[PDB]
């Protein structure tokens, strides 16, 4: 079930006997190129195949009687591990406050409501916070999702200070015993210094225990710079990969995890609030390579 280029790269070694390092090099070049065709950032794809090269050599690939299969298994296992190995979700505390952050259009508002529904069904009492005051009808959008999922939505006022947001959030959470606070932020470019500064100040005041970079699965090469900047300027604790019900390969997930070292917690698989499940590194590894 591989992509055509990988099928050709691996397949042409089959039944041809033991390989030389020249054969390994030519194969790894094609693997690198396949990863780029799957939207893995070019630098991350290079680092990845360099790692694979040393692992395959260390597994004595040059003495293997089935080098095509050894290389393929090495790539798949390395990609699975590089994407996180196994599913992992955020550690719940008595009180949890998470930000959803990212680029314009990535899926943040929808994802906030999905997380609210997911965790309501696991005994939490969420509170949605509509902190996007710039996009027209942004607060109405989240209000309407909140109604759909049966979760309250505190709406931030135009011009409201982070300290006022904290005060109001703390009071509502205390009164109603809300223990998972999900803060939906406006989409922003990673190079928009004022808006990145605003987001960092909100984090400083609200003290989120997770800051989730919501990344569209169709994101290209810029995923590396985007994830790095959100991590350096704000601090990312994990990722949500959205719109995986499309056919984008999702290589950006590798770019983002490579530069942050942070887990991809969840996958978005529908427009519907029910369209969230844990991220399975194994599954995305197969999609990237397929």
């Amino acid at each position: 079930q591989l992509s055509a280029r990988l099928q050709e790269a691996i397949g042409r070694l089959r039944g041809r006997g033991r390989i030389t390092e020249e054969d390994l090099k030519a194969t790894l070049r094609e693997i690198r190129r396949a990863l780029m065709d799957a939207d893995v950032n070019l630098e991350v794809a290079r680092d990845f195949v360099e790692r694979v090269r040393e692992e395959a050599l260390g597994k004595q690939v040059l003495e293997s009687l089935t080098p095509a299969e050894v290389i393929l298994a090495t790539v798949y296992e390395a990609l699975k591990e590089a994407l996180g190995g196994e599913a992992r979700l955020p550690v719940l505390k008595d009180r949890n406050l998470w930000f959803l952050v990212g680029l314009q259009g990535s899926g943040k508002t929808t994802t906030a409501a999905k997380l609210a529904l997911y965790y309501k069904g696991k005994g939490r009492r969420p509170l949605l916070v509509a902190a996007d005051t710039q996009r027209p009808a942004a607060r109405e959008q989240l209000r309407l999702l909140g109604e759909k999922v049966g979760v309250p939505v505190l709406e931030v006022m135009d011009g409201e200070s982070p300290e006022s947001i904290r005060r109001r959030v703390e009071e509502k959470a205390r009164l109603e015993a809300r223990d998972l606070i999900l803060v939906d932020t406006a989409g922003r470019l990673q190079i928009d210094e004022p808006l990145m500064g605003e987001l960092a100040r909100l984090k400083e005041v609200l003290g989120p225990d997770e800051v989730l970079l919501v990344l569209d699965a169709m994101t290209g090469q810029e995923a590396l710079s985007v994830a790095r900047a959100f991590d350096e300027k704000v601090g990312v604790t994990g990722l949500v990969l959205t719109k995986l019900d499309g056919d984008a390969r999702g290589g950006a997930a590798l770019s983002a995890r490579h530069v942050t070292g942070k887990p991809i917690y969840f996958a978005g698989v529908s427009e519907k609030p029910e369209g969230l499940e844990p991220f399975y590194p194994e599954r995305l590894a197969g999609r990237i390579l397929g």
């Binding site: 314009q104 259009g105 290209g220």
Partner: protein
């Protein structure tokens, strides 16, 4: 940066890196490099620019009165329509919008708020209303009231969802039922940060409703929008406008020379 002036081998290696980093993709990158290697020219900077600018040509005047705006979830459709209204009202056109996104929460409201800010009328219906029936109504109002341009917003949809691509065909057919010449423009909106999936989006929207143009949004970001190169090469669809922000003025007619200059920076 690409060392223009230096030796050929190092120019081509940084050019390759630059194109791939820009989301131009493997096939178009290789085509660009092969032609330049078989160029034999001392001013490589100008020869490369000329090849890329040639790949991207298959005030912007719509070919008719109705423009159907399509694209996947999140790309910038509704905002781009707002900007298009500002652009055309600045040229003296009588513009209206149809809030054809009757599916997503606050889709209609979002466009309605732009319409108020811009003094542009918006044809709207209740949530869940058939967008095809609404578009038909908007086209008959356009005709009866003598409007120059109608922009039809559509709900975000993934191109892998056959049923949603059919709904989009129904909207186009409804427009043509109201006015058999129309719509004379079907414009795909593509987010600049998109990788190689952009080409698949373009191919599938083109197969469904026949694109006459592409608008690339969010080019104020760091992404270069390079997947436009394989899109124009494959489908021969022209790039019409670029989005460069979140305000009503943040739209520019496509400028291939500047696009390519930015792509290589």
């Amino acid at each position: 940066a690409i060392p223009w002036g230096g030796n050929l081998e190092e120019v081509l290696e940084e050019l390759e890196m630059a194109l791939l980093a820009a989301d131009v993709g493997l096939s178009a990158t290789e085509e660009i490099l092969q032609e330049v290697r078989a160029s034999g020219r001392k001013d490589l900077k100008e020869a490369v620019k000329e090849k890329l600018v040639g790949m991207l040509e298959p005030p912007v005047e719509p070919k008719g009165r109705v423009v159907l705006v399509v694209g996947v979830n999140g790309v910038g459709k509704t905002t781009t329509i707002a900007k298009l209204g500002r652009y055309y009202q600045n040229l003296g056109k009588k513009v209206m919008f149809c809030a054809g996104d009757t599916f997503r929460a606050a889709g209609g409201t979002q466009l309605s708020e732009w319409g108020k800010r811009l003094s542009i009328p918006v044809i709207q219906g209740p949530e869940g209303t058939d967008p095809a029936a609404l578009a038909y109504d908007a086209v008959q109002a356009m005709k009866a009231r003598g409007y120059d341009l109608l922009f039809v917003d559509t709900a975000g949809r993934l191109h892998t969802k056959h049923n949603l691509m059919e709904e989009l065909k129904k909207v186009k057919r409804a427009i043509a039922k109201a006015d058999p010449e129309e719509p004379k423009e079907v414009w795909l909106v593509l987010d600049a940060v998109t990788g190689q999936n952009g080409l698949e989006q373009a191919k599938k929207f083109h197969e469904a409703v026949g694109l006459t143009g592409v608008i690339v949004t969010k080019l104020d970001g760091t992404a270069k929008g390079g997947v436009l190169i394989p899109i124009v090469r494959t489908l021969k669809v022209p790039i019409k406008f670029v989005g460069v922000g979140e305000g009503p003025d943040d739209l520019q007619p496509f400028d291939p020379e500047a696009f390519v200059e930015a792509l290589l920076e």
